[PDB]
Design a protein around this ligand. Structure first.
Ligand SMILES: *[C@@H]1O[C@H](CO)[C@@H](O[C@@H]2O[C@H](CO)[C@@H](O)[C@H](O)[C@H]2NC(C)=O)[C@H](O)[C@H]1NC(C)=O
Ligand SMILES: *[C@@H]1O[C@H](CO)[C@@H](O[C@@H]2O[C@H](CO)[C@@H](O)[C@H](O)[C@H]2NC(C)=O)[C@H](O)[C@H]1NC(C)=O
Ligand SMILES: *[C@@H]1O[C@H](CO)[C@@H](O)[C@H](O)[C@H]1NC(C)=O
Length: 409
């Protein structure tokens, strides 16, 4: 329940970790944590992609999914989830309290009176049909994050539950996110699949007239060309031309609660060095340094889609135990304490759509317990002069989506 207080809800999983208003000051602290994850996760992910191909994700989506996972985690595994997703940065000595505020942060995001921009979230546990999931686990999940445990047959019809999960996410994100879990990563041994969903749709505060949109040619690094639909408009915007001639433009959505932030550097320089210096502090320097201004905005009318596995990068960031069969401690999920429970692979999938009327983003993260850990299916071409995008929620300090547009064709 959103309407709640510290002691009221006894949200106590199996293992506690001790890291060496009040609620509002902690809800903010968790937002700080989320973005340090976002930033660092972004950086690691960028190394595994080219400089010229698109990148799109919801770092908040990922954070949430792994927080759901956390509830059944223990020992080393628990500790590492706290560190990697910067949840040990918050105040509370106890690690079962992180979830309290996470739910509260999720209450201010997905429930308001200010219904200008639609920003919805769904969570769902998909456990094996025959198994026995812990009673307390079940109700912490369902209470704190709203994740009901839908029984599915992983044992017999593995590949129909794989497509049932895909279809559930699919329904929850308006048709935009469908292929969350790559076809064959859930086998007979798969026990559980934890899923998160975020869906956004804003309308520009000051939209672009369709009349002024003109096709121009875009030239990819390859040495090829492609048409691109450029939009246009003049108006009063929060803008700034920061150090090294980098431009930071903010296009707010009806309401000013959620705004998009563009970031493009001077043509002679790359994005790479701006990418490499990105932190949650730097980003805030830029935002606080923004003044209003009459300016001409030329932004493409485009769509990008990005889907990948988080294993690699997450292991690089510090998530070692959770993915390993022998050391992964998750004994708070099933009946006795099946120690087997280890994560095979985790998948993310995002969609960004920008046009004259507004923007539409959507994403899904899924942690899969005990299936197959396949190699990722990623077919992308690379084109030039990319720009960073960020869809943020102002008041709550959270980065809903974030990405790099490098090809509007
Ligand atoms: C499900 O997990 C809970 C923890 O959330 C386990 O309950 C603990 O059990 C011991 C002994 O019965 C108590 O001392 C603790 O207070 C209990 N709760 C907590 C929060 O630790 C429970 O054992 C698990 N159930 C099954 C069937 O495994
Ligand atoms: C995994 O972590 C739990 C603690 O979270 C360890 O169990 C505790 O062991 C100490 C003494 O050895 C007891 O005083 C506690 O009551 C135990 N339980 C809990 C819930 O705290 C366990 O030893 C750890 N180690 C391994 C290797 O599993
Ligand atoms: C999702 O299912 C609900 C029924 O609970 C339905 O109202 C909605 O239209 C469905 N949406 C999609 C995109 O499938």
């Amino acid at each position: 329940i959103c309407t709640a207080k510290p002691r009221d809800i006894p949200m106590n999983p199996m293992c506690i970790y001790r890291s060496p208003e009040a609620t509002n000051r902690r809800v903010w602290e968790l937002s700080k944590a989320n973005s340090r994850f976002a930033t660092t996760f972004y950086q690691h992910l960028a190394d595994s992609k080219n400089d010229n191909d698109n990148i799109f994700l919801s770092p908040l989506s990922i954070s949430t999914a792994f927080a759901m996972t956390k509830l059944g985690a223990c020992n080393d595994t628990l500790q590492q989830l706290m560190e990697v997703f910067k949840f040990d940065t918050i105040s509370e000595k106890t690690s079962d309290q992180i979830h309290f505020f996470f739910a509260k942060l999720n209450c201010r995001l997905y429930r308001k009176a200010n219904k200008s921009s639609k920003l919805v979230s769904a969570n769902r546990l998909f456990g094996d049909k025959s198994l026995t999931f812990n009673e307390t686990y079940q109700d912490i999940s369902e209470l704190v994050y709203g994740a009901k445990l839908q029984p599915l047959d992983f044992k017999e019809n593995a590949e129909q539950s794989r497509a049932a999960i895909n279809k559930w996410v699919s329904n929850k994100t308006e048709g935009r996110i469908t292929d969350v879990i790559p076809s064959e990563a859930i086998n007979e041994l798969t026990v559980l699949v934890l899923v998160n969903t975020i869906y956004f749709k804003g309308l520009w505060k000051s939209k672009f007239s369709p009349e002024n949109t003109r096709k121009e040619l875009f030239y990819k690094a390859d040495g090829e060309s492609c048409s691109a639909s450029m939009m246009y408009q003049e108006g009063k915007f929060r803008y700034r031309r920061v150090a090294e001639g980098t431009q930071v433009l903010e296009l707010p959505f009806k309401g000013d609660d959620i705004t998009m932030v563009l970031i493009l550097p001077k043509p002679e320089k790359s994005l790479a060095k701006v990418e490499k210096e990105l932190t949650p502090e730097v980003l805030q320097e830029w935002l606080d340094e923004l003044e209003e201004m009459m300016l001409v905005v030329h932004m493409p009318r485009f769509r990008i889609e990005d889907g990948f596995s988080l294993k690699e990068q997450l292991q690089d960031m510090g998530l070692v135990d959770l993915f390993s069969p022998e050391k992964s401690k998750l004994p708070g999920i099933v009946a006795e304490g099946r120690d087997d429970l280890y994560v095979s692979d985790a998948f993310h999938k995002a969609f960004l759509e920008v046009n004259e009327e507004g923007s539409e983003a959507a994403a899904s993260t899924a942690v899969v317990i005990a299936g197959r850990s396949l190699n990722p299916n990623r077919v992308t071409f690379k084109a030039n002069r990319p720009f960073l995008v960020f869809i943020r929620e102002v008041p709550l300090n959270t980065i809903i989506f974030m990405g790099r547009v490098a090809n509007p064709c």
